Ligand binder design. Structure first.
Ligand SMILES: [Mg+2]
Ligand SMILES: [Mg+2]
Ligand SMILES: [Mg+2]
Ligand SMILES: [Mg+2]
Ligand SMILES: [Zn+2]
Lengths: 129, 78, 64, 150, 206, 102
RNA sequence: CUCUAACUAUAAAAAUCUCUCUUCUC
């Protein structure tokens, strides 16, 4: 190792308002939390790829000022009883993190998947739309 | 109809002596001269714009580039 | 800054959009000609044009 | 001549609430003039114009009338604004009302002063309104004091 | 330069060195180059022409509009209204007067001014209507270089038209003013103002 | 009349199975009737494979895949293009649509 | 006569409708 100060990217991409939240190896210390809704107007495109793109540029700049040069991606879906499929923005967030000079190591998916749900929201017939 | 323009006379229908010294003083220093350029400076009505513009072809105060009708294109004499 | 970049199309990926009036192409940068994007164009294009982009991280998404 | 903006600078800030008089509407949006500040133009887009679905624009905007808005982006080189209208909270409009009303009072008083003295509002504002706004945050409280304490 | 004797006496300036085709026998097509690299091949300065008037079949195939001389396209876009729609000799005269006026102001051979104004006044990113009815959206997209040329010509002529309407200035003078202002980035120009405002809309609607 | 001799469920000898929820609309649908699609995909698509490869430590890092079995509803399956209405003589065929790529 | 690899990603609103029906025998 050439002293690559490591962090974990720890992206959380729901179906709305994806999250980019870099932390140290322990994860107890949080730096550069800037989210998707932080930077986009429409309130409906918080999940849009452009939202995660700008959020990723901001976290990259902040972490580069910090001294962390390489990050560990921990992609998370909304998880739980919910859809638990990765959000649209998270992939753009990861791509923009990998663009802005940062080095990338050990991509992991850490979505909370249950041994079963307690109960899924929507009723027996579900969302009728 | 709707007189919201609120325009004034805004045009020298008849040339006055001081306005004559004005036309002559910036007869040069107006590096491009035309009827619209002349009336832009509030000092000519527009019919006498042609009169003053044609008179300036007396002692070569300005040179013609093209003398097509409906307009004129004049530059300073150098 | 003024990060205006250029991109020469290498292929045109049909015409998209609900209107049917926009197209989708695969552009490759004047620099680093091994780095390509897919981008949406609004107008007539063919293999050879040089688009001007104010972005480089954006990728085209099919318009519905 | 009504000019020389209320605040200490002619340009807006990034988050503020403001009130606007509409001047016209184009297809992509309306580039309108700010009244909380002096005269600088800026866009309000249809997608961020109405709260509900944008079925009509004539009923909502009512060009020539006064509305509440906010500002999201600013052009600080020659002057251009990006504004928003749907993101006006139920509490935002009330304080916009009071702020514009006090500003309108302090504007009309000094506009009368300029008209009676035939001197541009710029110099009068720089000589009187600006130091008072510096001292007490707003000149209207200073006017109330001058009514009471001279 | 070697005046050829003939039973018909063509004027000397028309006989001087005419392997040196000029636009109106006044402006050289050489020395004129396109600053931008994207819009080259969509601005036709390569072929010399003695008049900005050619009965060319420039609307038969798809992309021949590029091969039309750029000054000719400006002329054809000037003749745009019901009151004056077929009149093109008038458009040629207007363009000739505009070129002379631009030569007067900041000599800067007026073809180069035309080219620079066209380069500057064309938008580089635009929007399209993509909203599915219930939600109205404009999606930011890129513009073809040919459409950049077309749009630049369109706003230049539109600004000239709206400036000339019920105004003292002639159409040639207003067109020259717009071309001069769009040669630089002067926001006073209507065409450049529309370009900037459309681009900033498109930025606002990524 | 019977549109499907299998009744769609594919149960034939159980009486009752435990229902599962729809991924889109959360419809409590029996686990055999529900359409199950195994989405195995790349955690980073081909749009960013080059970028990640250039900007990653651990040379020749085998990037991981992501696996999810999606339990669609059936109204959702018709609507989300997952499954399509078929000809009455074509409903016979149960083999998957012939190996999209070889 | 020998063979299991590639892929995503749309759910705004839309209610109702007064006639009248007519033969096949080479
Ligand atoms: Mg339905
Ligand atoms: Mg049935
Ligand atoms: Mg089935
Ligand atoms: Mg049994
Ligand atoms: Zn369902």
């Amino acid at each position: 190792d050439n002293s690559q100060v490591f962090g974990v990217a720890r992206i959380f991409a729901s179906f709305n308002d994806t999250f980019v939240h870099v932390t140290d190896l322990s994860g107890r210390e949080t730096i550069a939390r800037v989210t998707g809704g932080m930077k986009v107007k429409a309130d409906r495109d918080e999940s849009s790829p452009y939202a995660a793109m700008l959020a990723a540029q901001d976290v990259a700049a902040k972490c580069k000022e910090v001294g962390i040069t390489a990050v560990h991606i921990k992609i998370r879906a909304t998880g739980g009883t919910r859809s638990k499929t990765p959000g649209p923005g998270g992939q753009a967030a990861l791509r923009a993190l990998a663009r802005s000079g940062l080095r990338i190591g050990r991509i992991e998916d850490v979505t909370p998947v249950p041994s079963d749900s307690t109960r899924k929201k929507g009723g027996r017939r579900g969302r009728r739309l | 109809s709707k007189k919201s323009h609120k325009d004034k006379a805004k045009h020298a229908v008849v040339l006055d002596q001081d306005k004559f010294d004005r036309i002559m003083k910036e007869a040069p220093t107006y590096r491009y001269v035309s009827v619209s350029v002349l009336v832009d400076r509030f000092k000519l009505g527009g019919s006498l714009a042609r009169v003053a513009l044609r008179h300036l072809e007396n002692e070569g105060i300005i040179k013609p580039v093209s003398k097509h009708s409906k307009q004129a294109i004049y530059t300073r004499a150098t | 800054k003024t990060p205006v970049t250029l991109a020469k199309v290498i292929k045109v990926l049909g015409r998209t959009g609900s209107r049917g009036g926009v197209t989708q192409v695969r552009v490759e940068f004047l620099e680093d000609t091994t780095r390509t994007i897919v981008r949406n164009v609004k107008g007539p294009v063919r293999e050879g044009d040089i688009l001007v982009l104010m972005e480089s991280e954006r990728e085209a998404r099919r318009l519905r | 001549t009504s000019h020389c903006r209320f605040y200490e600078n002619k340009y807006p800030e990034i988050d503020d609430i403001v009130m606007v008089n509409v001047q016209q509407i184009a297809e992509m949006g309306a580039y309108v003039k700010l009244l909380e500040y002096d005269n600088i133009e800026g866009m309000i887009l249809l997608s961020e114009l109405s709260r509900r679905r944008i079925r009509s624009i004539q009923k909502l905007i009512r060009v020539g009338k006064n509305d509440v808005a906010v500002v999201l982006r600013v052009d600080k080189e020659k002057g251009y604004i990006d504004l928003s209208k749907r993101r006006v909270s139920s509490e935002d409009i009330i304080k916009c009302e009071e702020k514009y009303q006090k500003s309108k009072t302090v504007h009309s008083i000094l506009r009368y002063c300029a008209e009676k003295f035939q001197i541009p509002l710029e110099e009068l504002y720089k000589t009187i309104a600006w130091p008072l706004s510096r001292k007490f945050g707003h000149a209207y409280e200073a006017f109330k004091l001058s009514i009471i304490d001279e | 330069f070697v005046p050829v004797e003939l039973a018909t006496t063509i004027p000397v300036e028309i006989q001087q060195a005419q392997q040196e085709i000029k636009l109106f026998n006044k402006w050289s097509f050489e020395d004129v180059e396109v600053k931008d690299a994207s819009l080259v091949d969509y601005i036709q300065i390569s072929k010399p022409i003695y008049v900005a008037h050619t009965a060319g079949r420039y609307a038969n195939k798809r992309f021949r509009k590029a091969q039309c001389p750029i000054v000719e396209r400006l002329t054809n876009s000037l003749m745009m209204n019901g009151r004056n729609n077929g009149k093109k000799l008038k458009a040629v005269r207007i363009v000739k007067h505009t070129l002379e006026i631009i030569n007067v102001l900041t000599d800067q051979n007026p073809l180069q001014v035309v080219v620079d104004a066209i380069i500057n006044s064309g938008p580089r990113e635009d929007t399209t209507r993509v909203g599915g009815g219930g939600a109205a959206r404009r999606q930011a997209v890129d513009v073809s270089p040919l459409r950049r040329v077309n749009q630049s010509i369109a706003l230049l002529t539109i600004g000239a038209r709206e400036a000339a309407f019920r105004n003292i200035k002639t159409i040639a003078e207003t067109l020259a003013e717009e071309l001069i202002n769009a040669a630089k980035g002067s926001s006073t120009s209507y065409a450049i103002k529309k370009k900037d405002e459309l681009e900033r809309v498109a930025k606002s609607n990524r | 009349p019977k549109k499907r001799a299998s009744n769609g469920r594919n149960k034939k000898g159980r009486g009752h199975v435990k229902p599962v929820r729809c991924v889109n609309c959360s419809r409590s649908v029996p686990k055999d009737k529900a359409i199950k699609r195994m989405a195995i995909r790349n955690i980073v698509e081909a749009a960013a494979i080059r970028d990640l490869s250039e900007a990653s430590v651990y040379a020749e890092y085998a990037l991981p895949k992501t696996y999810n079995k999606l339990h669609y509803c059936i109204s959702c399956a018709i609507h989300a293009r997952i499954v399509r209405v078929r000809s009455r003589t074509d409903r016979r065929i149960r083999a998957p649509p012939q190996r999209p790529r070889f």
